[PDB]
Design a protein around this ligand. Structure first.
Ligand code: NAD
Ligand code: NAD
Ligand code: MG
Ligand code: MG
Ligand code: MG
Ligand code: MG
Lengths: 340, 343
């Protein structure tokens, strides 16, 4: 059956007198580094010479090049982009990773592609959060956490498991649950969410917007209804708690419930299911890996073009107009990652 | 060209010495009643003899039958299901609505069907929140608000507009924005969200779950990724703030962004937009209106069956298994609708 660790199944004892090198200070790196520090764990940041290095220094961390961070650490968290794992692993990590040290990745992709490998005398694990940084940090400060998947890939020490789960406890994942799952299955699940589900959800919101605008509806009202009001986001996030069909049962007017249940299970043709299968085949069969390696070279120039093009889509032009005219509920983020 | 009111464009002055009758204490009724009370507005609840009547009493409101609430009110908010509007308006509201009093609906449907009509000497308006009750209440207490649309249908007094916007300010909608929109267009927009977009989003989440499970993926993990983790919910909520493509640009790893942009705009066949058009045709043409009255005529017996049947779906079986095994971050809701300070 499933193996799920919560607070009662993990301790910070294994991190006593140990230094964690957080490699990278991006979406994941910044949240791990902040949460580890506030949990009373000795933390160092290893980063290349870019804005994240300066940010780590600004937020009161000990910041060096990656090689120096790895050399001075008992546990190394490789929280940089997956395509950068190969070169950073071979040049900066492997040569400096001490005897009996633990290397952790937060995604199985580099393990699947063979860019990160078990090293003699050393431990290798995946601790893969099911959430991005800002929520991981906000949850942690409220005494809450996001779920994670973990895999002990190589355990020379025999202590990898408790050290990985101690990191997971210190960063807050054990407040939700840390489930045993193979790095291979994590990779395919994770890439599936990013390549089928997220695009298809945004494509559908966009489809609702475009059809309403085509048929003479107020573009601001169209944008608000399909997501801009936050209603669809609230339904999906409350749904994570009580279930999606249950949100409609509890929070829906009878008119809303009658309409919802008329089309529930009837909106999507078989082609959607088939395209999801096609995306999974591309992820598993090496097609996506080749596409990603291509896109990575020239420092993701293609991705930059795609990002700028997206902002000029009618949906995102309409978003800008709505957000200028309607105040959205936000929380102050100033010093969110400074010491607690 | 849009007319959008924020806090600077409304005041509570028009509610000075006025009593608001909140008809219903449901998803909308409870939030309006709570926020109005905390804003220092005199509120009474009119409700039929059910669990909502007792809840209103438990939460410290002056509670009576609908007719008595209306008879003692300057402003009446009709916050009960749309199919109940006709009978309640004819029997309970119209005969008891004072000269120069304002009646507000939170949805245009009863106005489009003619179940709620302008009355000589009285004001008629729509104030339609773009949000359900709990967030309306939570936002209010945080000094924030949900957006709303409004339409002045009949204005005998010539003061309908300022009184409607005063209610909107009292319940917090002006902290986000309250936009002028015809009750007809609101009806079609609102029903479209409920009949195309919400079902299709859940259908899409379910498709993701089914495909992963049918290919041997861990059912708990499949459920977490497609919504159960809260990640897709957070993306869509953060997206409402900064934009959906912008959330991916800011919070997505480069691996995630490369994957997202590979399929963005390519996932859906033309049949999806065709169905969207078909749903609007059913909404606009009277097909849905007839379907709803049929469903209501048996006290929503078919809906009760559909609700129970939905809990047996593999997605909702997996949800229960995930929720028993993983603790989810939630705020305590115990005190949510009891008296608070004005923010
Ligand atoms: N973003 C998420 O929601 C998320 C979720 C779970 C796991 N992860 C995983 O965490 C890891 C980090 O992803 P992220 O989203 O934090 O990325 P990010 O884009 O925020 O990473 C930026 C960081 O990586 C460093 N970096 C970038 N290119 C580098 C290079 N060539 N060499 C060395 N350092 C480099 C930067 O200096 C900075 O510290 C990845 O393995 C990713 O798959 C991300
Ligand atoms: N739910 C939403 O998110 C939402 C959003 C905006 C507008 N609205 C509108 O608000 C109004 C109320 O919807 P809701 O979601 O609060 O509904 P609800 O299901 O929560 O309504 C329950 C309330 O209606 C009363 N009620 C039910 N049947 C009645 C009847 N036959 N006669 C008298 N009272 C009756 C109950 O006693 C209770 O007070 C509707 O016009 C709806 O379209 C709802
Ligand atoms: Mg992920
Ligand atoms: Mg509605
Ligand atoms: Mg609505
Ligand atoms: Mg990922």
């Amino acid at each position: 059956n499933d193996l799920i660790y919560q607070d009662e199944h993990a301790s910070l004892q294994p991190l006593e007198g140990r230094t964690v090198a957080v490699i990278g200070y991006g979406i994941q790196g910044r949240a791990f580094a902040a949460n580890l520090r506030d949990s009373g764990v000795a933390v160092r940041v290893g980063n290349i010479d870019d804005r994240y290095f300066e940010l780590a220094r600004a937020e009161g961390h000990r910041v060096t090049n990656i090689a120096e961070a790895v050399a001075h650490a008992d546990i190394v968290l490789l929280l940089i982009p997956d395509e950068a794992h190969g070169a950073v692993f071979d040049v900066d990590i492997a040569p400096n990773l001490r005897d009996g040290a633990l290397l952790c990745v937060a995604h199985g992709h580099s393990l699947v592609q063979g860019d990160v490998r078990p090293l003699p005398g050393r431990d290798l694990a995946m601790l893969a959060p099911r959430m991005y940084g800002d929520p991981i940090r906000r949850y942690y400060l409220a005494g809450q956490g996001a779920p994670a998947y973990f895999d002990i890939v190589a355990d020379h020490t025999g202590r990898a498991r408790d050290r990985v789960l101690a990191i997971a406890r210190a960063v807050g994942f054990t407040r939700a649950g840390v489930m045993a799952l193979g790095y291979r299955q994590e990779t395919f699940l994770d890439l599936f969410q990013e390549q089928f589900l997220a695009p298809a959800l945004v494509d559908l919101v966009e489809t609702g917007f475009q059809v309403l605008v085509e048929r003479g509806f107020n573009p601001k009202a169209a944008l608000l209804e399909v997501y801009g009001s936050g209603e669809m986001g609230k339904m999906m996030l409350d749904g994570a708690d009580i279930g999606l069909d249950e949100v409609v049962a509890l929070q829906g007017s009878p008119t809303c419930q009658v309409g919802y249940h008329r089309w529930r299970g009837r909106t999507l043709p078989t082609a959607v299911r088939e395209l999801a299968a096609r995306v999974l085949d591309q992820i598993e069969g090496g097609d996506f890996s080749a596409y990603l390696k291509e896109q990575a070279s020239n420092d993701y120039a293609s991705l930059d073009d795609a990002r700028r093009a997206a902002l000029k889509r009618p949906l995102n032009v309409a978003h800008a107009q709505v957000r200028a005219a309607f105040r959205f509920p936000t929380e102050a983020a100033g010093g969110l990652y400074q010491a607690a």
